[PDB]
Structure 1
Amino acid sequence: PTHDVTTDRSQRLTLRFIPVDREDTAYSYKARFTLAVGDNRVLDMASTYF
């Protein structure tokens, strides 16, 4: 299909997100993230791993 699948304006394929909060305890640590999906995108969760 020649058109109407791929875009043409610069957009990234892979995204890396930093934690915004890390807390530590001797037997577990808690990590938070603020994931952001902008408009005109669809993210399938099968491709997110730590």
Structure 2
Amino acid sequence: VTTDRSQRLTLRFVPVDREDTTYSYKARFTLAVGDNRVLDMASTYFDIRG
């Protein structure tokens, strides 16, 4: 069931690019899934601060 290798349970991605307009914001990320990971998208969320 569980790997005994070094591996993060939670990852955080900083935006590689972001753009602003008078009424909206847009950010681009490279969501990386490593060579033996599988990611259930339901676990993902946009953590926003302001």
Q: Which TM-score bucket, shorter chain as reference?
A: 0.7 to 0.9
> Is 1:15 aligned to residue 14 of structure 2?
no
SS in 1 for 2:42: helix
Structure 1, unmatched stretches of 5+, are none
Q: CA deviation at 1:29?
A: 1.2
Q: Show CA shifts across 1:1-45 (max 9, x none).
A: xxxx11111111000000011111001111110110011111001
| 4+ long deviations beyond 3 Å | none
Q: Give the strand-richer structure, 1 or 2.
A: 1
C-alpha RMSD of the superposition:
0.7
Pick the structure with greater CA Rg.
Answer: 1
CA distance in 2, matches of 1:25, 1:38: 34
